[PDB]
Structures are given as structure tokens and as C-alpha cells.
């Protein structure tokens, strides 16, 4: 009771000191303030990070099977970082990006830097100096599994005696991190995979590069698709679930879900309905959503419709959901 809580709180103190920001931390803390934070679009995922958005000046890794929604976030994370006089850079190595879409999210493509490395070392060296500049305030290495070494991509082997794509990543991230912090340029890395089977086995290892990325990232996000959608017709989109499996700026293991419409991507509107009920700020009168008095409609997408008609009631519902959490 006495000397205990006393010796502990003290001990941890002696820890964070010679060990980064919050090395140790109880899963039920309040967290301080990393101010610099990029809205991830989805608010659900925002409070999830505890800090409300991606911690600026750090390395983020969004990993998950295909069709999940990794970039959608990343992109948004850019659409926001941008709509604030920010400069974004997109180190593409998958040659898989669709402006039309990234435009409907809020990215200023025309003003978006987008390189296309021919080798791994290249993709990373670029991001390095393209970081020192203190200009960029967010870069997005698209596809870690794609950062193939000059070697394997130069016939001379595919491996033979190495761990290159691993030795590679490590080397980079290393001198790549110290520089990120200074320039305060948060860096997102997209990881590619294939989903579960009830209980995970698979390859938490890595696409031989992410091994290091694990220890260097300050936040890691497990973006898995949970279930598709419908509303009379066929399907307007996927609902996705993100499990923040690591976090050195707030408590980890938090959850967050939200809708990705095949059209506009994230569904702010609907993202409110969900957190609207979970926070009582809106109620259900039997599949008939209603916000104190006036009903929104029968069915999430219907209330989404109505919520998508008038910005006011929305900004209001938003207004409250945010004050009940900070």
C-alpha cells in the first residue's frame, strides 16, 4: 500500500528517463499531449490511438491482407496532413495508386510528391534525403514487401547468403528514424499479407524486412477487413477493423472500426452514428435511429443518408462525441 506504489511510480520514472518517452505504461492511463497529430480520418481510430490521430514525427506501419483498406487510411492520413499546409510524399513501389480515388478523399495530388524507385536502396535512400529537407511532413512508403534489393532484382541471386531485404530495412530505418524525429515528419509504411484462420500462425516474422520495422515503429496498425455491406442494391462498401497492436505514445491494444464506401472511402457520417449510440448521444427506437426528438431513419445507412443531408445536426453530434472524450 505505502512503499509499493511509491517504489513503483519511482522505478518507472527512472525508466522512461533512459528509455524513450513512455516505454512502460498501465493500459488504463489518461496520456499527456503529443499535440502534433494527424487526424486519421476515422474518429473511431483516432481516440483509439489515444492521442487522436497519427503521432507526428514517427514511423507508422499499417499491415494487413489485401482489400483491407490500408492505403485508404494512409491516403486520408495524407488528405488531412495536406489540408493543413502540409507537404506529402508518396514513395510508390507497387505502381498501384488511383488519383481519382485519392482525390475524392482529400489529397492534393497535383501537389503530391510521388517517386517510383527502381530498387529498394533507391526507394529508401530517396525517402531519407527527401526527409532531411524538413519539408515533407508525411511520406508513404507503399508496400514494404516491395522494397526488393538491387541484388535479387539484379539476377545476382534471390538470397544466396544474406537477409538483405532485412539487413536493408534495418540499416535504413536506423538512420531513418533519428532524422524523422527532428524534422517532425511522421512516416507511414504499408505492409502486405493475408488474413487469419481463428488462431494465428502465418508469419508474424516479416516479408523479411518488416522484422526490423517492428522494433522501429512507434505505432503499428493491424487493418483487417471484417465484413462487406449492402442496402437494397448490392454493396456500397467494406467495414474494416483496426487493432492498434503497438503504441509508444499512448496505451496499446485499442480497437476501432469504421465504414469504407467503395465510393468515398471512410464514412464520417456513419462513423458518427456508430459512436453516436455507443455514447448514448443518439438512441435506437427499434432499428429506427433517432437523435433526441427527430429520428434519423430506420437503418444505419438511412440515418447515414439523413446525416449526410444536413451538416448541422452532424457537426453537432460530432461536437458532442468529441467533448465527451477530449
Curated annotation (Swiss-Prot):
ATP binds at residues 67-72, 98-101. The keyword Transit peptide does not apply. The keyword Nucleotide-binding applies. Phosphate binds at residues 67-71, 192. Keywords: ATP-binding, Cytoplasm, DNA damage, DNA recombination, DNA repair, DNA-binding, Nucleotide-binding, SOS response. Pfam families: RecA, RecA_C. GO terms for biological process: DNA recombination; DNA repair; SOS response. It comes from the Bacteria. HAMAP family: RecA (MF_00268). PANTHER family: MITOCHONDRIAL DNA REPAIR PROTEIN RECA HOMOLOG-RELATED (PTHR45900:SF1), RECA (PTHR45900). This is Protein RecA. The gene is recA.
